[PDB]
């Protein structure tokens, strides 16, 4: 059992004092303009806001804690030094005079040079704050570009494989497209007759992942280039798989003309249980007029912010991006280097051909499995459901893989290990992948047991969702 | 240097049991063509080095520590005691809530982070928590949009310039038409509201750090069938009547305010509440408490129909990664300060700002242009352009004078207070503002 | 279960990489002094030594976590603060030119004199690493201070009451002197006439807690202290006790001549599971010129420290003191202010007796319940072990109080709040130490069970000791 | 401000239940002559305000990061994974682990750190802790004395100055007799050593940086009844063979250089390893592993006989608090880096020392002191006095020269480099040093 911050609260009680004179309200503010029913925040003393988050914390799990193999998620040691790197910037005002803030700048600048070697694109906007963010940023920019052309009224479509990401469809639709799913072929790879059959001058892009969710590479991604191509169809790269090939292959190598980064993924910027991220967006020099405003330049006085696009499909936030973000980032790349980024890249898939190699043994099935790249998907044999198996693991020490998904695949256990887990660790965890096989149904189904809560009602969440402690409405 | 474990003959015995004769192997599969890029990249540094070069970068900038810029990030107290806690490994480490069971402390956390959002806005309900204020408008917007079925939107000019570019851009995309209502001596004048208008937009304090009567604003929104979205700072609705009270719908802001480090514009996060009624039409993840099977209270994620995974094409936004570990920052300054500590600091910053004001109106040449009452925000006129004179600020060591553009009218700059700002400080930068003119 | 660090290694796996290009030992260091056999340190990567100190974490409790109800012990809350003004000052070298670290001893001079102003103190030396280190410090003052008059050869007793922490008469010990106990009267205070009896000129000093650790005050201080001074007897205050009357009451003012100071206890510094800490010592005027070098002055320079100080002790331990808790000390301090202290120090009293009365109500006796200060020694009722108590405890997720001590009560309950708990947060305390006494005996006795670890097993851990993970020897 | 929580109604219900009129009337029964005293004390300052201060006081240091300064502290490189790890609340705010079934965190990690101390030191066994390394001596020295029976010291002058201080102060207060062995060329000779000798004491490298023969010496003790104490940098021990390894009975010294920020002297840590024979006689706290009700593996605090509570005026010494938690950043600094990563930081901390020397031997006038081998601290005869130059190169910016007490010989100064230090810094040393003479 865990108290709410708001049963913590005594009538009266303060918590910081932050205000040693404190003004009259009426003598600063009209009558009229006053909060007259203040807001009901939690009254508590310094201590029991301590005693709450760290006990909250203790109801909680993280990379720093558990071995997290979500796939597509990329759940990579969060060194501790990049949180002292971030904290060197924390007093920086995005306002203030530009000649003042040249160290953040220049960051800024590096950080999309080496982002831009790593993925062969020629411009690139530091600006969105998450991987889906990015996508809207490309999607809208393909728009632009299109536009342009003078074939605004007729792309219309965007394409999107059986196995994306639910956000890629999502975007779609948020950027005024329609969207067309092609299916994956038997080796889980794109189906070329059903690409061919799609493209068309009402196309306006196709998006993909590479390697594929599936944790394979597309093989035939050059001849998937040229079909586009040669259709006026612009390639999406969504870049949240770049892991397993950072350093060894680049997207813009393989024919892609916009790509997005996930830094909370790939880069090691922390989860932080949701948020927040960085999705930085890189494009050929054919795109690079629509880029968001504005894009760090580095001039001859020094480094700037450049408004001075013409063609930008304008702003996608507040600022110039989630730049602590980007320090991390930063700091990441200049520790590992190309050497560091190739070894991590070849141990995430090692890590993961490895795991997979083990769960086969103890009878998990895997329907696509071709190369193994940072990732895989399995099944459990029959008659067992990914939910139950994900709770058994729960019970045991350890933390599901991604669950249901891609959704070409049932009872998907989508398992991305990454390259700073130990073989020792990965072992453990087929281990228990295999002892739960070993287990009664009902055990299974009636898992967890030991967590600070067990299986929740769900079906009471959604009829009667409690929104807020004061649930109003 | 690097953050894999593993040792020579680990990778030796793996490489042998997947069948690849060694590392560079793996890849062999991949189109020949595009193996070995010429990729350029600064040698690996140790992280002693790296923390050298990164101190190096950072001793090129000036701290904005105590500045007096505003335009919707201001140098506001960063309590330790918050960010101890949001430094909790658990906190900092966890990704998304999938598995309820072992994520309740973030679950908890975010339940409690809805709650005070939602009372800061006078409000009933509120995401988990979106990039930050710009996006969050946008999606509030659009929700509007969706709630209403209708695609015209009123956008007052006192919006923040770079959150009405970026309604714009998401509102277009969708193919919903933006007017824009221009100010008139700082405020909005009351529109007239079509039938064709699914939304009226209004930001208090405005862009020019302004108070704006919301109350008519949203009844004429009411009258024409619109929902009002109101654009609130969340340290002020610690003072000041929220969006809630006035007959908002749906309120947004950016959270920066709420304690978090300015980090040159990122990250923050981005609050968005609105009715329980309109809960169908809401973007983002959502948390809600329930029981366990044992009767347990327990919370988790819900209605998840309006998200990605489940609706795709037809999610009610693409959002994925949100902006959760600031929220919880958030979250965690409104609990530390609870409702008179928020209204202690809010109104110093106001107070502060106001004889920041005073001060300035006696600097030569020097005229005021955001009318009263104004917040802890407010823009002069002044006799050199901003632009010059924020650079001569900061080459005497100050940072001041935040250039306001010139579709609000000519030689305009914002100027801000917080409550870490003491007599003396005004003085100084008045000083130095004297000598620049 | 939880493994041991050495556990996690593996041979030649590698963690921290601080050196780039890496000397041979060779060619710095003659064959003859180079070490043949390396030290089984753990051999773990970066993620693995986080995951085993977060987890080691998480089985542990502190006030962070937990009320922390310790007699003699001071377990207030350590504002996060502070931590952050520690690390202000990280990067100072103690031989680095004084001109360049004026910011470091203008902070030491300032705390002084704020000590120096609560205790009634003239001079104060901020050296000693601890409470007992203060101890020792403060008794080869009182005894430098003998010898110099000529009565070294005589003054050869320290006089400790039979209440007095352990630390007491094992300092007597490290100073060469002779330890007699007096024993307390039948208020729980100091017996007058015990102690008439053996004062005299073979008496070097008088060790005292006030109020004392029974957590009542010593009412008749004047007259011990007019005792003492009468018969050339020097008194010395135990500091432990000072957050009953900070801003309330001085030790100067009672006629104590040395006083050691807890800023560990008292003034916030971290307990941080045992130390480190930091014991100030202060004196009477007739005492300063024994104080160890080096002391901090202000001189028309600037501050600085002095070693001209020809009738020293010398030094107790290297270089100046535990600067970074002095730092925190000061942070606390200039917070509170004077009336924050006195408030603090009345709030402390406050919840102490509050939560007397509570307990006694549930049944839990006071054998000296005279007006509680900011502690009470209570014991379980007849047939209850306090031990048992104290397990039971922490099954209900409390952590007790201290116990066995003072050795003059049986099954003693030492509690003290401290100022920064809650009045609910007392009441819940209470009533679980209620309902313990409801428990069957064989549950108290066999209590925890739901800890990491239950019982262990102490006559092994005395009988069969391993100190090591390697047990050599 | 103030962190209690206490609301007015609460105070009152309180005292009323105390039967107290107010909270003064707590303190009615103290001496009405003592109370209210005239205490000065600054004025209240919010926490904001308190870090302004501490900003102000720390702007007028030049901070020694990167310090050539030598002397028992250096400027080594503080991992902040480390710093993150002991930040954690319940390391931080933990008290002694007096109830281990909650406390097995501390206890393990105790015992770890124990495990980790006694294999660096080349021992069987160490305890939890001593304050610093000068009273790890001392309290060490006593040790031997009470094993031997003995009251005799021979103390080489190679010990640092302090430590040879505080060892002093220790000795004379229980009648022990110290002699003093001089060195001679920089180093140790061999003394003749009589029964009365209970303990000879040898530091390695000594306090000038010299590289001193530990064996003949633990012989020489060993031939006459004595103990051989050995004080040694635990960083060193990363490479060096350990004092265990020549025949040491017992091995101290200060934890600074395993990551510890400086701190302008503290706080750090010391550490006392020895044999299991001389168990008994060890003084503080010790970590044992044993088992649960159940048969759990578990730690927990043993042969407390030797410590004040139990044995009060009998105890070993009188000490309590310790210095555990930064003995446990230690011991993760330890586990951090691992053998080889330790014995990397020790090389590359002597490479750049020496390749210092040979740069500062250039300048005209500077002479060495210290022989070789020395370790990654050396002494140099200068032709200005070491605290006129260590001055001057603070006006340039730089932190060198630590001045050397006469008794070693005139005009000597101490520096010292680290892994930290690159070729550009050595370089930049050698000029200012080259101008300041
Ligand atoms: C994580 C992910 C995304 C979305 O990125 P966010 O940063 O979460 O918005 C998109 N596509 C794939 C394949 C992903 O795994
Ligand atoms: C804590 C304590 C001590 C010893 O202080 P340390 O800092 O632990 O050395 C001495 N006397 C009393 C009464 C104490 O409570």
Same mark, same amino acid.
């Given at each position: 059992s865990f108290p709410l911050i708001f049963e913590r609260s005594r009538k009266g009680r303060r918590g910081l004092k932050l205000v040693k004179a404190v003004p009259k309200a009426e003598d600063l503010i009209p009558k009229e303009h006053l909060r007259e029913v203040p807001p009901r925040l939690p009254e508590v003393d310094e201590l029991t806001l301590v005693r709450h988050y760290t006990g909250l914390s203790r109801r909680q799990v993280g990379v720093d804690t558990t071995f997290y193999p979500l796939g597509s998620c990329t759940?990579?040691?969060?060194?501790?030094?990049?949180?002292?790197?971030?904290?060197?910037?924390?007093?920086?005002?995005?306002?203030?005079?530009?000649?003042?803030?040249?160290?953040?700048?220049?960051?800024?600048?590096?950080?999309?040079?080496?982002?831009?070697?790593?993925?062969?694109?020629?411009?690139?906007?530091?600006?969105?704050?998450?991987? #889906?963010?990015?996508?809207?940023?490309?999607?809208?920019?393909?728009?632009?570009?299109?536009?342009?052309?003078?074939?605004?009224?007729?792309?219309?479509?965007?394409?999107?494989?059986?196995?994306?990401?639910?956000? !890629?469809? #999502?975007? #779609?639709?948020?950027?005024?497209?329609?969207?067309?799913?092609?299916?994956?072929? +038997?080796?889980?790879?794109? =189906?070329?007759?059903?690409?061919?059959?799609?493209?068309?001058?009402?196309?306006?892009?196709?998006?993909?992942?590479?390697? !594929?969710?599936?944790?394979?590479?597309?093989?035939?991604?050059?001849?998937?280039?040229?079909?586009?191509?040669?259709?006026?169809?612009?390639?999406?790269?969504?870049?949240? !798989?770049?892991?397993?090939?950072?350093?060894?292959?680049?997207?813009?190598?393989?024919?892609?003309?916009?790509?997005?980064?996930?830094?909370? $993924?790939?880069?090691?910027?922390?989860?932080?249980?949701?948020?927040?991220?960085?999705?930085?967006?890189?494009?050929?020099?054919?795109?690079?007029?629509?880029?968001?405003?504005?894009?760090?330049?580095?001039?001859?006085?020094?480094?700037?912010?450049?408004? =001075?696009?013409? $063609?930008?499909?304008?702003?996608?936030?507040?600022?110039?991006?989630?730049?602590?973000?980007?320090?991390?980032?930063?700091?990441?790349?200049?520790?590992?280097?190309?050497?560091?980024?190739?070894?991590?890249?070849?141990?995430?898939?090692? !890590?993961?051909?490895?795991? $997979?190699?083990?769960?086969?043994?103890?009878?998990?099935?895997?329907?696509?499995?071709?190369?193994?790249?940072?990732?895989?998907?399995?099944?459990? +044999?029959?008659?067992?459901?990914?939910? =139950?198996?994900?709770?058994?693991?729960?019970?045991?020490?350890?933390?599901?893989?991604?669950?249901?998904?891609?959704?070409?695949?049932?009872?998907?256990?989508?398992?991305?290990?990454?390259?700073?887990?130990? $073989?020792?660790?990965?072992?453990?965890?087929?281990?228990?992948?295999?002892?739960?096989?070993?287990?009664?149904?009902?055990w299974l189904e009636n898992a967890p047991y030991s967590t600070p809560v067990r299986r929740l009602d769900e079906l009471r969440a959604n009829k009667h969702p409690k929104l807020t402690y004061f649930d109003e409405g | 240097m690097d953050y894999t474990p593993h040792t020579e003959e680990e990778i030796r015995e793996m490489l042998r049991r997947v069948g690849a004769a060694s590392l560079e192997d793996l890849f062999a599969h991949l189109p020949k063509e595009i193996l070995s890029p010429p990729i350029d990249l600064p040698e690996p540094l140790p992280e002693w080095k790296v923390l050298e070069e990164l101190r190096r970068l950072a001793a090129q900038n000036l701290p904005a520590h105590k500045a007096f810029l505003g335009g919707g990030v201001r140098s506001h107290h960063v309590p330790p005691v918050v960010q101890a806690l949001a430094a909790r490994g658990e906190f900092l480490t966890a990704y998304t809530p999938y598995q309820p069971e072992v994520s309740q402390g973030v679950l908890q956390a975010t339940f409690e982070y809805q709650t005070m959002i939602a009372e800061l806005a006078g409000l009933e309900i509120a995401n988990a928590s979106m990039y930050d204020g710009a996006t969050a408008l946008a999606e509030g917007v659009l929700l509007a949009l969706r709630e209403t079925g209708r695609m015209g939107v009123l956008v007052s000019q006192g919006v923040h310039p770079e959150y009405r570019a970026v309604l714009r851009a998401y509102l277009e995309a969708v193919g919903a038409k933006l007017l824009t209502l221009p100010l008139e001596g700082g405020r909005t004048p009351l529109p007239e509201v079509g039938e064709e208008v699914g939304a009226v937009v209004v930001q208090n304090p405005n862009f020019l750090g302004a108070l704006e009567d919301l109350g008519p604003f949203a009844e004429a929104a009411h009258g024409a069938g619109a929902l009002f979205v109101a654009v609130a700072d969340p340290l002020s609705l610690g003072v000041l009547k929220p969006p809630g009270a006035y007959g908002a719908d749906i309120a947004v802001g950016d959270g920066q305010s709420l304690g978090l480090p300015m980090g040159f514009g990122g990250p923050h996060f981005g609050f968005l509440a609105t009715k329980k009624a309109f809960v169908r039409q809401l973007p983002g993840r959502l948390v809600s408490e329930t029981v366990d099977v044992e009767g347990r209270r327990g919370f988790i994620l819900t209605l998840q129909a309006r998200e990605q995974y489940i609706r795709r094409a037809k999610a009610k936004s693409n959002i994925t990664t949100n902006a959760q570990l600031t929220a919880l920052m958030g979250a965690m300054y409104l609990a530390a300060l609870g409702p008179e500590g928020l209204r202690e600091v809010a109104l110093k910053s106001v107070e502060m700002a106001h004889k920041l004001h005073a001060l300035l109106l006696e600097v030569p040449g020097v005229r005021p242009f955001t009318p009263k009452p104004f917040f802890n925000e407010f823009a002069l006129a002044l006799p050199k352009d901003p632009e010059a004179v924020r650079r001569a600020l900061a080459e005497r060591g100050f940072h001041g004078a935040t250039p306001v553009p010139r579709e609000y009218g000519e030689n305009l700059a914002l100027f801000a207070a917080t409550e870490l700002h003491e007599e003396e400080d005004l003085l100084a930068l008045r000083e130095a503002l004297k000598e620049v003119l």
């Open positions: 759940m990579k040691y969060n060194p501790k030094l990049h949180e002292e790197a971030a904290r060197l910037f924390a007093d920086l005002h995005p306002y203030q005079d530009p000649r003042t803030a040249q160290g953040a700048l220049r960051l800024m600048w590096e950080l999309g040079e080496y982002l831009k070697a790593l993925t062969g694109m020629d411009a690139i906007t530091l600006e969105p704050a998450a991987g #889906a963010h990015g996508e809207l940023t490309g999607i809208l920019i393909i728009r632009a570009y299109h536009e342009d052309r003078g074939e605004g009224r007729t792309r219309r479509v965007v394409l999107v494989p059986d196995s994306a990401h639910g956000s !890629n469809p #999502a975007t #779609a639709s948020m950027a005024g497209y329609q969207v067309r799913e092609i299916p994956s072929g +038997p080796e889980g790879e794109v =189906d070329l007759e059903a690409l061919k059959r799609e493209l068309g001058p009402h196309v306006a892009a196709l998006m993909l992942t590479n390697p !594929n969710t599936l944790g394979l590479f597309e093989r035939r991604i050059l001849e998937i280039s040229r079909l586009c191509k040669e259709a006026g169809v612009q390639l999406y790269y969504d870049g949240a !798989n770049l892991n397993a090939i950072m350093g060894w292959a680049r997207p813009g190598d393989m024919g892609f003309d916009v790509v997005h980064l996930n830094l909370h $993924k790939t880069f090691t910027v922390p989860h932080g249980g949701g948020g927040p991220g960085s999705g930085p967006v890189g494009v050929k020099a054919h795109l690079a007029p629509y880029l968001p405003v504005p894009l760090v330049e580095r001039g001859e006085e020094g480094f700037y912010l450049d408004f =001075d696009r013409p $063609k930008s499909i304008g702003r996608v936030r507040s600022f110039y991006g989630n730049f602590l973000a980007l320090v991390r980032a930063w700091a990441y790349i200049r520790t590992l280097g190309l050497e560091g980024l190739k070894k991590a890249a070849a141990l995430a898939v090692l !890590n993961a051909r490895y795991l $997979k190699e083990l769960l086969k043994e103890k009878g998990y099935r895997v329907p696509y499995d071709g190369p193994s790249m940072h990732e895989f998907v399995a099944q459990p +044999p029959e008659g067992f459901r990914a939910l =139950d198996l994900a709770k058994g693991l729960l019970e045991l020490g350890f933390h599901p893989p991604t669950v249901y998904f891609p959704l070409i695949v049932k009872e998907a256990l989508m398992v991305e290990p990454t390259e700073t887990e130990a $073989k020792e660790t990965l072992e453990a965890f087929a281990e228990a992948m295999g002892a739960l096989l070993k287990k009664p149904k009902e | -």
